[PDB]
Structures are given as C-alpha cells and as structure tokens.
Amino acid sequence: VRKKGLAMAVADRAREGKLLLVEAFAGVNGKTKEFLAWAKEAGLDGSESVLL
Amino acid sequence: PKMKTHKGAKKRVKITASGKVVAMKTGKRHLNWQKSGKEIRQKGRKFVLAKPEAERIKLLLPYE
Amino acid sequence: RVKMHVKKGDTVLVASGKYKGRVGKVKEVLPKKYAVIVEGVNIVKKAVRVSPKYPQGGFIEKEAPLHASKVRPICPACGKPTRVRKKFLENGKKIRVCAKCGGALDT
RNA sequence: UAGCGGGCGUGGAUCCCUGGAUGUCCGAAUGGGGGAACCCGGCCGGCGGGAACGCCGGUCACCGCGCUUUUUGCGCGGGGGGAACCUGGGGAACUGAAACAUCUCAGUACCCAGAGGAGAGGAAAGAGAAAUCGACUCCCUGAGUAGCGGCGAGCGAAAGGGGACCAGCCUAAACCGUCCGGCUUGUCCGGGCGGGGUCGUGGGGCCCUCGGACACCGAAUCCCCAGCCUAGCCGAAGCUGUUGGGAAGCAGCGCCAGAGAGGGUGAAAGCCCCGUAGGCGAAAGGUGGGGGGAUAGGUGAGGGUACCCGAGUACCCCGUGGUUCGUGGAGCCAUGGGGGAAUCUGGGCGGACCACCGCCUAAGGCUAAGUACUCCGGGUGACCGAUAGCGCACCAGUACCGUGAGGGAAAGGUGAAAAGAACCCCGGGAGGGGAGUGAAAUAGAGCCUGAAACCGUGGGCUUACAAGCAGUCACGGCCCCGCAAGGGGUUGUGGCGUGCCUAUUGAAGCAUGAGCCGGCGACUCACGGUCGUGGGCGAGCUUAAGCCGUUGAGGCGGAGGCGUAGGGAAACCGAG
C-alpha cells in the first residue's frame, strides 16, 4: 500500500508537470542568493513551496 | 487483556469447522438396565444449534 | 545574569512612537526592567501643598522614564544596530561599518 | 518596596560561576537531661582584680568490626532521612462464583527492616530429545498456549525462536612452610598466616615423566588528556512619507540569510529590543576507560599412586510454601521435626518408581551491561486557562475544623507607562460635584470585559361588580414607529385550555424532585472478538520487539499470527 502511496502521490505530481531533477545545483556552497538567482533561473518565482 | 477461552466447553464440545456447533448426547450414565439397545445406539452422539451461536462465540480466539 | 542591554548613558536618538524622532539626550539607564529616562516623558503630578519642598505652588513634574526598546544607536549618521569588536585589547563598539562607539573619550 | 538617609565604582563595584569562611539553639542529638529549640555538668585551657559569680574554644552516649600484656586504651565505620523504583520478613477484607467455606480477589493493598543508583539476580546436580544449546536481568512471539478447578467462577506458565546486552571469577579441602595453643612430648589435636587448586573426554595433590620456555594475553584497579556541567563571548540586513492616541499595518524603493524559531517593542517587524543558525569558552570545582601508559593477574602434554573436592547436608518420613500443579500417578526447588551418606561405578535430574541412555558436579562466595522508576535539570504537546488546571496562578499545606491523628478553603488582569487625580466646593469624615491627566476615567484604584437571575427610578398601555397552569383565536379601545402596505406593542370582550420531569395498568393529583439564575456535570477508552464497511492484496496477507534515520521525516527489520482438509477424543485415515 504505502509503497504505491509515495509512487501514486509523487507520480501524480508528475501528472501536473511541476517537477524536475537537476543534474547538479549551481549554488555550490549553500548560500541563499546562490540558490535564489539559481531558482529564478530554474523556473522558480516565490509563490510556490518546495518539497525541494 | 486477551479474553480467556472458556477451558470447559472447549474441553467438552465440537463444532464442524464450517460453523455448526454439534455436541454430545447425555441422559446416558446411570440408566442402562431396564432400557434397551434402541437408547444405546441413539445415545452415541448429538447435534444442536441456534444458542450454540452464543456458544460458537464462547469458544472464541482459536474458534475451533 | 545578562540583565545586560546595549545602551550606555551618553547620547542617542529615539525612534519611538510617543514623540517619535525626538532628539534623545544623556539617557540615564534605569534599570534592569528594560527602560530609560532620556529627557522625554514630560507630564505633571498633582503633588499636594507640601509646605517645605512645595510651598504654595504644587503642580509640577519634568522628565519621567520610558521603555528601553524605544531608542537606537548614534554616530556620525543614524541608528542601525551596533557592532562590537575586541580591539585586541579593549572592547570598542563601532557602528554599522560607520566608525566609533558613539561614546568615545579614547575608544 | 516607597520615603528618610549615606555610600560605591572603567585603582573595573552590584550581578552571575567556584572554593573555602563565619556557621549560635533545636533535630539520629550523641555528656546527663528534658514537656523540642530549655536546664544543669565534669576534666584540658583562657578573661574579667577573679579563690566563690560567668563566658569563650577543647573534650564526653551507644553498637559493630580490627588491633593493644587482661591493663592505659588506639583504630575505621556505624546510627538519620528518601516521592517513585528495590529485595526479603508478616499478611488482610470487600468481590467474583448471581448463596457460599474449596478457590478468587493476591502474596495485592498494608506493617517492619535494610540495601543502591540501581538493585535483585547471576556461571549450571542447568535447559530437554536431537549425539541441542550453553551465566544474569530486558523486549518480543511462543499462547490465554501447556496446565489448574464444588473439572463452576475463574486462574493460568516454560522450552524453541526473533533481538537488547555481553563477563568473567574469589575460595575451601587435597599438600606444604611458618608463628600460637594446649597436651595423656608427641614422627600430636585445634588455631592464625603464606603457598597450593577450582572441576566433566573429571579436576588437581605428591613424586616421577615430556623441555620448559623470551613471551602472549592484561582487569572490576592506578593515573592522566580530548570532552562533559556548574557563569558567559560574539554574531547577519532601512529609510522616507501616510491615516491613527499609538504603527510593526498603507504606498515607493532597498536589504540579511547556515539565521522567515519565539517573545516583546503603546497593536500585526526577517533589517526596532531580547534574541535564532553558526562559531569559541574554565582560572577553581565536579564528571568521564573515549584513547593510552601502568597494574592485579591468566596459558602445556604424560604414568602411577590411590590423597581431597564443600555434613546435621543430600537422602527416607512427617507437617509443607512456590510452580501449570486446589495433593492428583505428583515431579523439582525451598524447610520445621525426627531417622541420618559418600567423596567419581561417588551424587542429583530427565514428572511416582525399577531397567537402558543422556544432562550436569551440589550443599561458601563477587559481577558491570541492557531492566525499573520519577524528589529533580532542561526539552516538547491535534494539554487547561482562575468552578479548568497539581490541593496550592496572588505569602498554600496559610485560613480555619477538632485536644487529637488528621481535614482542607478562598483569593488573578487599570494603563504604553502612575501621568495613579493637586486646587475650589458641600461635607465630621466618608464620598462626591468641578477642574486637571491620558487615546480614553463606561480604564478611577481589588478599576479591561460587566451578562443572567436581581433590586430600583421615568415613561407608554392596562387595572378599584370581579372566579385566575395566567395563555391562546378574533374583534374593538389605545399609544408609538410607517410613504404605501404594514409593524411593534398593549389589553377592552368572548369561544377554547387538568404545569414540567420522574414514577406508573393509570396523575391536576392531596405521590415527588424542584425558589429563582450563572456556571461544573454522566455512554469514553485499553485488549480481543465479532458482523457489516472503505480500500492495497491475491492463494496469498501482514510484521512484533527493535534497528537505521529524523527534529512533527521516514524507511528497514518475516520471528510470528492469518489462509489453503478436514474427519476420529486418540493412534491416526485422508476428500474422505
């Protein structure tokens, strides 16, 4: 059951289209504006919350 | 905690593993003398049901 | 332990709410209940006819205290939270990159 | 926590951290006391001039264990408390059985005592069916199974396996060396002390034999250092205007981030104050195998002899607790009496007992670890907001109850901040009328809110020929809202009418609960079953303890229960 759970849920997100697995994150030191400009570039904005 | 199977009726009854509680015939102990074989071969087994639904319950946990 | 605040009895502005943007004076730290008596809360008490210290005229007050979270630093600029450094020897607290503790006299 | 009043610090006070210090009188009280916190006293020593009065510091009750020539005595400890957890020493009744004695409740509450962070326990006369494992406590399944019983109520375990955890040993006795005792001197009986050994194809002793060896391992012990706690240190980014009493809220631009946890800042801030992530920190003290030095200390093969291996015991009986065992064919452990072994063909067990085969070496001892709990430190919650919450939110084990053991309350909020109301006025004051204060005094001092029952004062309608579970339907009088239409209200008349709840064959009942109101207050859950149901699954399902991770983050762990064959009570026969 719960196996499929994740699957279904996660895969259902995929049905919408809101998803991606970047090869490697450009902001390599863990600092805010790195990932921030990175996100503005990676299809992000601000009003959308991230099981990231 | 875990309900206790009634050791007694457990130690003294049958129910065919389909759900039909079928028991053992009595009135057979201190008689026999002026009686006949008719009562003998009849006093060999028994039946029952309906309230042995409540008795089917009393068996409980291992059902049996 | 660490009743310690950040305000020193010298001179500092007041970004309050009562008389907002009022020039804050010598300040007088009082006490450990986060408060200050700058030169501000001006009212008047209904003191009695108390013949000695209050002759035939009794209806007067000057500067009453106030809250300590109502002021901000001062330097050749404005407030902005103070940064402290160990000077190697002493312990000067220069302002937001803008220099000098705001109290001075060899620090 | 105010006034009076006087001091102290950048020669770094207060404040927090540590160590010591002064530490009176009570209290195990401990010199003797004694009705607790009071009254006396002895010896060492001192001060007042101090031999009589008095103080100061010293010293003293008892038990045990270990020494001292009995002696003079020296020595270390003891004794008290403690909420829960803890081991033993005694041991209830109510109840269930729809009575009630067997039984149960339960060896449970409760009394004693002691032990410590632990304990308790603990290295095998084991466990039990196979030539199987191998101290202890803990979690799980085994399983309500195996057992138990006026075979009623009901009570009710162990192996196996899946994990936590890991730990092993001190001895006596064989033999030997010494000091002591005594004695029927003697190739001696008992004692203190060192060597000696520790058991399952037995272990050593003693002599003889193999070759016994640098080493090889190494504590529960010694000591130290990383750390850990008792205080801290620092630490990211903003303004202008705007309504408002007050902005943090309204717009304009800008900003920190490993930190947009939270509280507070006159309200609602990531850049106001306190802080959050991160990063350092002990001079003195306490705590720690984490790492190591070190230390106590541990290891061989063989022949013979014929030495010892735990004595008022095991073993039989009797009276028996515990365990599934309520005495049954009744085992094993433990023990009160009586009978009373041996030292390995010795002993105990394999559920009465005898035969065959296996298990393990008794009657002396110490053991960390995981267990258990909450006086307590911090941390959290689909926990509560002054009838709730702990009994105790505020000086609650205070009031006050009773000699007494013991009972057991009530009682919170002004504001951002006291600015907590001078001066006039009436008044003895009290309290108010003004003023003055703040945003506001409908926040005015047990003062945010202020209801209900509730007692007043004004007004509208109605009432002084009238028969009432108090209203209802209609109509008129009326007064006031209304553009209309209508609406509130009120009752002048007349048709209709035996309160509520409980209880009852059945109530207006002259059966009862109830004065009125505010509030508190009763069908839940924990295990398992059982029918129906929503879904994943499919002859398949699903893990339990736990472990890995987490900081509201999940996955992993197949022991096991479920399901396919039942039928005979059984051996067992098998879709029969």
Swiss-Prot record, chain A:
It comes from the Bacteria. Belongs to the universal ribosomal protein uL4 family. This is Large ribosomal subunit protein uL4. The chain holds residues 100 to 151 of 205 of the full protein. Part of the 50S ribosomal subunit. Coiled coil: none annotated. One of the primary rRNA binding proteins, this protein initially binds near the 5'-end of the 23S rRNA. It is important during the early stages of 50S assembly. It makes multiple contacts with different domains of the 23S rRNA in the assembled 50S subunit and ribosome. Forms part of the polypeptide exit tunnel.
From Swiss-Prot, chain B:
InterPro entries: Ribosomal_bL35, Ribosomal_bL35-like, Ribosomal_bL35_CS, Ribosomal_bL35_sf. The keyword Ribonucleoprotein applies. It holds the Pfam family Ribosomal_L35p. GO terms for biological process: translation. Keywords: Ribonucleoprotein, Ribosomal protein. GO terms for molecular function: structural constituent of ribosome. The keyword Ribonucleoprotein applies. GO terms for cellular component: cytosolic large ribosomal subunit. Belongs to the bacterial ribosomal protein bL35 family. This is Large ribosomal subunit protein bL35. It comes from Thermus thermophilus (strain ATCC BAA-163 / DSM 7039 / HB27).
From Swiss-Prot, chain C:
PROSITE patterns: RIBOSOMAL_L24. One of its GO terms (biological process) is translation. Keywords: Ribonucleoprotein, Ribosomal protein, RNA-binding, rRNA-binding. One of its GO terms (molecular function) is rRNA binding. Pfam families: KOW, ribosomal_L24. The keyword Ribosomal protein applies. GO terms for cellular component: ribonucleoprotein complex; ribosome. Gene3D superfamilies: 2.30.30.30. Part of the 50S ribosomal subunit. Belongs to the universal ribosomal protein uL24 family. One of two assembly initiator proteins, it binds directly to the 5'-end of the 23S rRNA, where it nucleates assembly of the 50S subunit. NCBIfam families: rplX_bact (TIGR01079). This is Large ribosomal subunit protein uL24.
